[PDB]
């Protein structure tokens, strides 16, 4: 009965190989990318068929990034395949308060971005998944705020037309959408021209998420 022995040996070999591959794959970080207006894939791809996969390493840590803006089907029907990712990177353009949507002029672009962020944050699948937030076009917003006061998008706002408090108000409005205050956290960062602090911020956020996950895996809480 050499055939049975060979079959058992082959099963053991291709079980050990799968176990080793799983152990190797569990050690890396996976991130999802999202954006409303310009698909949120412009800055990050350069800064570092149907889906886009990007690998990069920083200080001995392997990050994969999944860009899904080429999928124009219904979001409900394939978002559950992404359950279990480490974090979701959401891109919002600050210089869109005075602009209008291409399809219709009734809805502002930043309102659509807010709606998409609200839908993503409070989804039933993504309850334990953290969200990193990028606010782009800081210099263009700096230039635009003086000419156009921030009141077409936020009528209830009451403050002087300066960059600091307007940006703080925008960040507060975006962070206030979260309803699971005790399960997930949102990290807000203003992207800078120097392409050396964005990756550091991503590394810090991923480290914090990994620490908070290990706090639960070890059974401490």
């Amino acid at each position: 009965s050499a055939e049975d022995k060979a079959a058992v040996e082959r099963s053991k070999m291709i079980d050990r190989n799968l176990r080793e591959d799983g152990e190797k794959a569990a050690r890396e970080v996976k991130l999802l990318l999202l954006g409303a207006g310009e698909s949120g894939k412009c800055t990050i791809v350069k800064q570092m068929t149907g889906i886009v996969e990007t690998h990069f390493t920083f200080k001995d840590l392997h990050f994969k990034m999944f860009d899904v803006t080429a999928q124009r089907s219904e979001r409900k029907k394939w978002i559950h395949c992404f359950e279990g990712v480490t974090a979701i990177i959401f891109c919002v353009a600050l210089s869109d308060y005075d602009l209008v949507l291409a399809e219709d002029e009734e809805m502002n672009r930043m309102h659509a971005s807010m709606k998409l962020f609200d839908s993503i944050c409070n989804n039933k699948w993504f309850t334990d998944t953290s969200i990193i937030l990028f606010l782009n076009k800081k210099d263009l917003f700096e230039e635009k705020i003086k000419k156009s006061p921030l009141t077409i998008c936020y009528p209830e706002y009451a403050g002087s037309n300066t960059y600091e408090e307007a940006a703080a108000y925008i960040q507060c409005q975006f962070e206030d959408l979260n309803k699971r205050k005790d399960t997930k956290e949102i990290y807000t960062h203003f992207t800078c021209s120097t392409d050396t602090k964005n990756v550091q911020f991503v590394f810090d956020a991923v480290t914090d998420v990994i620490i908070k996950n290990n706090l639960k895996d070890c059974g401490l809480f």
Binding site: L18, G22, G50, I51, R72, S73, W78, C81
Partner: protein, 335 residues
């Protein structure tokens, strides 16, 4: 102008269907005695998957099966002795379907990458290599079946189905006419017609040789997730997300009867028939699996063995055993 004509034609179709309805199945099937409660005990459990499991397909010899998971591994098992025969790595880890060739030569895989990969099993080197990659679709693959060793049929999320040609790697026929995403596909026993169920709650009967739609069946309220023929090829059963199942009829061109219960509120992820077409297996969302009766609509058994949502189900050609795969990363065989 044309809208009024289409509405009038639909009214004539509805009137003809109502006229052709003389009696229902339940009225004339009451004579037969109901089948006893089915007690099914698990025989084997297959382990080795590290993520969710999305599809499976029994072989034609009722011994080998193939399973697909999010970890990027397509595993071909051996159900008799639990041994694993093959484990093929995947280029993309986002997969939603798999298939097993009727002759046991090739396997298929697809998903969010919009590319259908066909792998060759029995090679001269004794290992698995990529035999072909099919591209040309504009949406995520949902289901793919093998008519024979040379032709494969796929159903994509861009409201289209395609009959391919593996040797040339180019599309041969394109079936369009749906409204929403196509999420199911089954081949008739004679391998000449197939039905497709899309998100618009409409099941269409296609024609492989002609390339044109023949009949359209409605009656569902939500997305249709599974479809399968009767063993004779004369009727089929549909399962949707609104917690119901329905049995249609090709010749009568009318719905026959429905399977539903007041304690069920979760959608259906897979349906299947038995060898004689008497027992209907349905894998519900609430970690359960039900065994209806094809003639009485009476529940006759529940297969509760999974710790997560059941995603795929299959029945061998001889009807000896039924295999269920869930999101718990385990395949279980019942007999």
């Amino acid at each position: 102008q044309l809208r009024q004509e289409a509405e009038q034609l639909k009214n004539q179709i509805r009137d003809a269907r109502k006229a052709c309805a003389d009696a229902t199945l339940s009225q004339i099937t009451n004579n037969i005695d109901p089948v006893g409660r089915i007690q099914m005990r698990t025989r084997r459990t297959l382990r080795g998957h590290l993520a969710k499991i999305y599809a499976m397909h029994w072989g034609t010899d009722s011994r080998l099966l193939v399973s697909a998971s999010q970890d990027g591994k397509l595993i071909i098992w051996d159900s008799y002795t639990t041994n694993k025969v093959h484990a093929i790595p995947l280029r993309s880890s986002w997969v939603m379907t798999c298939a097993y060739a009727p002759s046991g030569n090739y396997v298929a895989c697809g998903g969010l990458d919009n590319i259908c990969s066909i792998y060759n099993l029995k090679t001269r080197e004794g290992n698995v290599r990529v035999s072909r990659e099919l591209a040309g679709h504009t949406g995520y693959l949902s289901c793919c079946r093998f008519l024979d060793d040379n032709q494969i049929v796929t159903s994509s999320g861009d409201t289209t189905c395609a009959l391919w040609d593996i040797e040339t790697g180019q599309q041969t026929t394109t079936f369009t006419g749906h409204t929403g995403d196509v999420m199911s596909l089954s081949l008739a026993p004679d391998t000449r017609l197939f039905v497709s169920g899309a998100c618009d709650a409409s099941a269409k009967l296609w024609d492989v040789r002609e390339g044109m739609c023949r009949q359209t069946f409605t009656g569902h309220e939500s997305d249709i997730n599974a479809i399968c023929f009767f063993p004779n090829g004369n009727a089929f059963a549909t399962g949707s997300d609104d917690a119901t199942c329905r049995l249609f009829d090709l010749r009568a061109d009318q719905e026959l009867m429905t399977y539903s219960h007041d304690n069920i509120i979760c959608g259906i992820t897979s349906v299947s028939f038995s060898k004689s077409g008497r027992l209907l297996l349905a894998g519900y969302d609430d970690f359960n699996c039900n065994v209806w009766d094809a003639l009485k609509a009476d529940r006759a058994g529940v297969l509760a063995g999974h710790d997560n949502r059941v995603s795929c189900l299959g029945v061998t050609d001889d009807g000896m055993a039924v295999a269920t795969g869930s999101w718990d990363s385990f395949l279980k065989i019942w007999n």
